[PDB]
From a paper:
SHMTs are α-class pyridoxal 5′-phosphate (PLP)-dependent enzymes which transfer hydroxymethyl of Ser to – typically polyglutamylated (polyGlu) – tetrahydrofolate (H4PteGlun), producing Gly and 5,10-CH2-H4PteGlun. Here we report crystal structures of a chloroplastic SHMT enzyme from the model legume plant, Medicago truncatula (Mt), which similarly to At has seven SHMT isoforms.
The holo/apo structure of MtSHMT3, with one tetramer in the crystallographic asymmetric unit, shows two states, with and without the PLP prosthetic group. More precisely, two protein chains (A and B) contain the PLP bound as a Schiff base internal aldimine to K318 (holo-state) with full occupancy. Notably, no additional PLP was added during the protein expression or purification, thus the prosthetic group originates solely from the culture. Comparison of MtSHMT3 subunits in apo- and holo-states revealed that a fragment of the protein undergoes significant rearrangements upon PLP binding. Two of the loop residues, Y134∗ and E136∗ (an asterisk indicates a residue from the other subunit of the tight, obligate dimer) hydrogen-bond PLP in the dimer mate (see below), which is likely the reason that drives such disorder-to-order transition. An extensive network of non-covalent interactions secures PLP internal aldimine in the large domain of MtSHMT3.
Residue numbers in the entry:
A (entry chain B), B (entry chain A), C (entry chain C), D (entry chain D): 82 to 533
The structure:
């Protein structure tokens, strides 16, 4: 019998994990969908819970030996409801979805028939692929393959959801399901208006709270559970848990449908097999923490840090999509600054500032993203405050200046020409990038980081 | 800053995990889809890899900061190919699927249009729900909602796939995709015959090797890659890795279709979002082990142990479906013994023997399965040999005798009647169950268990 | 062998036809979709052409004996092209559709896949039901069952197609097909604007000219063939042919599609069997006449007569949707007059004036149509001129006044209670209706009626 | 205005009808689906009923109105029920379908959802295309586009429907609708066995009696109304009416569905616009005649004539599919004679014998049909008896002999080369064809032909 540790069993994987750990510690991790989960969550996820098959629901399993798995799943469900301040007679929860996308697809499967109509926020306006996405030449999202999705849009001149136009187009298109929630929407959502619009056409109403779940849990943002029928979420991002998903649903019939029975059946036996109990373990851990005063303080700090960063970017004369943010993220419209997000993302990454390019309202080309998305959750977890997020803004500004300089110096007009130029060993702004990286890492490495 | 460990942060979850670890340790785990993953796999799965967003493929991501994630995913893909002895110019692999069910649904999304025709082994005859399942009342599986599935069946008198009838029904139904592979099939599959049948109608041909992947990697069973276009698998079960999935595909065009592009696009952006890099890390670890001489020895012992158990059960005059097994599992037809699998499963579980009820070909009641499925992988991993599996058969036989005695003594005629009776504190065979449990636990606890 | 004439073979059917001759002679037929076909058409329709099976296309049939049927179909195609002034190198035609709805469904089948998206004018705004129609809880049109339809609407303040809103909703919905044409639209269509909008989303563009085909043939209205890809039509309404349909199509590839082969294959073998050669014979007859100067004079009289009626109704203080008409019909909004179209239709019918109740923009419910649709083609065929159409307006006005008086005598608010009151044998406005009927019949019986 | 007769209005169309009348008079019309309708039917179809409006789109249901009452339609319905010996409390009928194929499609639309499963007799084994047909390359029938069709087949050794295999394949495929009836099946149908099989999967059961309706009305063949839920038919073929269709249905709920409401709504407004009252007029006329003793004698003569022909063809050493016929047609397997149906059909057409090439069970390709379909109804209508049908068999045999001689003179295998050879002005078997044609026409012209 041999059961070596990772350093003994697999030096290459061990080494790679160590490099990634090294990278996380010294980088400014500004991806709005990333966080740093706890040592406790990691210990539950890296446990023997992975070994068990438990298809079905607690007390209602296909296989034997599930006494402790059932205790865990019941505990996890109770903590999910408690974290979002829900009465268990009004709301149920399924904690088995493997991720945010499968959670959404299970909802669609539960309440819609194939080719039924869905409306969600348009992808280039801050939406998520799983709410539907079609190009001129293909159905890109599985949502747009199996269902008939039509987007609603921001007023491109403002960067806020055009509720009046949604009202008009919903009346014409007659969706069965309207989805609120977004991947890159910097403002809070008018949930009352979504309800009015859904009722106008007898639609189901869902909130995908993946990006804002912890802010909702901490009552920093408005509560979608006051207005919607169904709520989906990832358990990573805002909630700072393991990689997984959850679906919350009203237990009272909605449009004559028992959502509990429909959603549970869609998850299993509909779409998934055995639950990932190791993940469910981690989720229960994170949901306990979600109820704590420290988590509430953390989420308020998230929004204060994003505000500090936004204000300083604006002082450097950047334009923000929608003019600001009410949440954990900001979208910088780089077009007025004379550059795009693809170019800026690469230079910033080379200096250990990690974020992503993001499309901006008005972008001519989907293949050239006009902006960058920046989030505060991950570095807020590490204990950075408002002053440090102002420094982050200055470091970003320095990075964008380097990117602008690199753009002018590259002869080629194409994004790929920019990439070849910056990655070449004769790249002439290497020392400016190193100087920036030195400052970035000098900030990041002053702070602890959670994990095993 | 506070980053307590699990015992400190969440005593309730910590205690549950300890109880589950110990239950696994003192039980005979005979669920054919269960195994005990390694310490090294758990270490990778419980690492900081969980923190990274990396939508896309290596070298082509939608976020910064992916240097090390890309190294890991490339390593994982190259190990997957090596474990199955595949030339990378002819075979590709996607290691992102979240589990076996999403792996399969991604394949269907890649190569089929909604409502295209699929044939898989019937669920009551050892098939998996993800290959399609409909009752008289409804479409149960997502596969049967979004696609048009029609089963192929065993010859009910032999328990072997009725290849002649599949030939005839494929010619009539004209499936776009034929699926080989099963959850509870005790024999090797005639892949050459599947290729003949697929070609007769121009169908794509897939193998779902979830239950047999390790046996294939070790060359104990026949290689499906000699005959099929696409192979899907869970990474847990036979491969003894983390909970996840993989899809392998030919890189030469099949029926005019670029499978690489189709399958990769179906996984992302089609159906999933960010890959679970912690799982991918664990997968890379298990795929290294899968190539080792010890893994080959293990897989040969799995088959030898199943054979030792089967033969001893036959000495106790149990009937096996198909007359035996070529693999890691056996199906006991309990009907001639005068009992069903639902009843036997529960008593065995009370005695710390975990297996599952299973439908037998010819079962009249879908609700009341006539058999049990027993697998050797998990206890083989702990180091049990043929003598010990012979003792397992005796203990099972002892449990079935208790179950028969229990079935006789309960007045109630339904399964739920049997359950209430066996769980009553005045249950008259409790001492027989406890005595059996002592013997079971006295055997199990002689062997170590892997994991952290 | 006996082959009696109808009067001997079937006295009851002969009697029914004689009654119908009487009804046609005595009545003012103002149903905008009705007309009177010629004796010559009727003699072709009532011939031995009905005996022949001729599946396929001329010179390419699946039945022998089709030399003369081939002759006829080619002649019919030649005449259809000449009647609409079309270059046969640029346009083809299929003359086999059995009616307008199946003609439209054949087009959809040819160029779309099931559940592809279609936009047509909303039924309650005077659209054709076969362009798509769904209520709050059912898909009523087959078009809306098999395809995904979303309407476009009139500007309610002008009664004209809201082209600006169509431009916006098309961009969001992304129809594969946009349909122009209407059952109750009193204006010509901006084909250039439809082309612009279609091109903005890469849609096919079709005109359904069923109601206006003769006006188009006579160059009274704009030519859709200057801008659209596909034109469908009935043969009975405006062309004064037999009951049937035709589909015209570009012969140059449109969006990579050979419309000729696609359309021909959808008609047969896709949706229909053997062509109705008696109908095709009658159609050929009417298409000869459609080229004549007298047909052109007739179509100009149609519009002049509608103008005369429209102007006199406005003198009687009726509101017309869109303030008038460019074509053969008026849509009268009766809401300001204090009564609905269902009550008025019935009273007018009792007085031998046949027309249709019709929804009007701004109506709350389809159950209470606010208007009546009135058309000049049928009575223009009989020889009525502008002065006689002014007299018709006066007669309609008398009928509306009787309806208002009747309404005041009915206790209920339900349309059924009105119907019961006005049909009751002692209905106290019987003398008024009788007096109006005498005026109506005294106008009608001054004019002959074509036919055998 | 003018109202010229056809000879004056359109001498070209008049000349074509003159030619077709002569062709019908001079030829042996042996197409099994053809017949000669009566003068009385033609007089009704060629009447002012074409200008009658009964109902039109959008229809009374749209406005929430009552059932439309029409004297001619009611008469037609009463006569249809009477002709088939049906109790009107148990059966209803819709007489509005425009032909057989749209009648069938309306049934599917009424009782099925898109992509629901249908089984019908395979096209190459004598099925009808509207029951479903797909090649390896494409969905040819609209039925197979909008629904999921799977065929059932004949036992190729007997030429009879393989009821045992249908039982098996229905249990696997689980159709929602099973269709009985055929275009080229020479035997009666075991309706009791279809009912048994339909009930085994909870399927609706329909009979398409288009080819055999008159034999059913006359009690020559078994009554499908004893067993099925729905019966469709053409009105032209066996009933000898105008070109049209009908749908009969049970009035008691079937599988919880009100068939009356469903079917009526699918026909109109679902799939068609207003009824064709001229056709309904002709239908009423033929349904009166269908109740007469003379019609019953006629239908018995149809069977006797087919038997005389069949027996004489066997004397000439032709093989008949199924070894004979119970009905109005025979399917001759020409493979033992060394020639295909396409070549034979052509030569026979040249000698004024009109019939159809037809696939034979066991043919390798649909591109080379192995047989010919020959029917007695049309020439039976003209007054031919058994002796004359024996002469017809002799004349067919002469034409087959000519075809074989022609085949030997042609260089190569391509049917086009055969066609060019036989149509060449100096075709060297022209005198043999002319001598046969003279015999054919000398027989045909002894008999009158019905019609105006």
């Amino acid at each position: 019998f041999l059961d070596y540790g990772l350093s003994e069993a697999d030096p290459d994987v061990h080494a790679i994990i160590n490099k990634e750990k090294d990278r996380q510690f010294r980088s400014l991790e500004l991806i709005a969908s990333e966080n740093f989960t706890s040592k406790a969550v990691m210990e539950a996820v890296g446990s023997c819970l992975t070994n068990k098959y438990s298809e079905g629901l607690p007390g209602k399993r296909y296989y034997g030996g599930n006494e402790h798995i059932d205790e865990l799943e019941i505990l996890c469900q109770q903590r999910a409801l408690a974290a979002f301040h829900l009465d268990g007679d009004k709301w149920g929860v399924n904690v088995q979805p493997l991720s945010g996308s499968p959670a959404n697809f299970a909802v669609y499967t539960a309440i819609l028939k194939p080719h039924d109509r869905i409306m969600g926020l348009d992808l280039p306006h801050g939406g998520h692929l799983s709410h539907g996405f079609m190009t001129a030449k293909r159905r890109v999202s599985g949502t747009s393959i199996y269902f008939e999705s039509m987007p609603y849009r921001l007023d491109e001149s403002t960067g806020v959801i055009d509720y009046d136009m949604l009202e008009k187009t919903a009346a014409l298109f007659r969706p069965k399901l309207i989805i609120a929630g977004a991947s890159a929407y910097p403002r809070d959502i008018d949930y009352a208006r979504f309800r009015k619009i859904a009722d106008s056409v007898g639609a189901f109403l869902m909130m995908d709270m993946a990006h804002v779940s912890g802010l909702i849990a901490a009552s920093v943002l408005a509560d979608p559970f006051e207005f919607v029928d169904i709520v989906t979420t990832t358990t990573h991002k805002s909630l700072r848990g393991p990689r997984g998903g959850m679906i919350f649903f009203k237990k009272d019939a909605v449009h004559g449908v028992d959502l509990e029975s429909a959603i549970n059946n869609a998850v299993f036996p509909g779409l998934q097999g055995g639950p990932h109990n190791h993940t469910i373990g981690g989720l229960a851990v994170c949901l306990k923490y979600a109820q704590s005063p420290d988590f509430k303080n953390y989420q308020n700090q998230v929004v204060a840090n994003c505000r500090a960063l936004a204000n300083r970017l604006v002082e450097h004369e950047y334009k923000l999509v929608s003019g600001g943010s009410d949440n954990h993220l900001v979208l910088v419209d780089l077009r007025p600054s004379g550059i795009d997000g693809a170019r800026v993302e690469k230079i910033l990454d080379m200096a250990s500032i990690t974020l992503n390019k993001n499309s901006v309202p008005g972008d001519k080309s989907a293949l050239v993203p006009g902006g960058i998305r920046i989030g505060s959750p991950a570095m807020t977890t590490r204990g950075l405050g408002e002053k440090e997020f102002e420094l982050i803004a200055d470091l970003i500004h320095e990075g964008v200046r380097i990117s602008l300089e690199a753009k002018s110096l590259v002869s080629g007009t194409k994004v790929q020409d920019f990439l070849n130029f910056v990655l070449a060993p004769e790249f002439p702004l290497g020392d400016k990038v190193s100087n920036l990286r030195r400052k970035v890492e000098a900030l990041a490495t002053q702070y602890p980081i959670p994990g095993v």
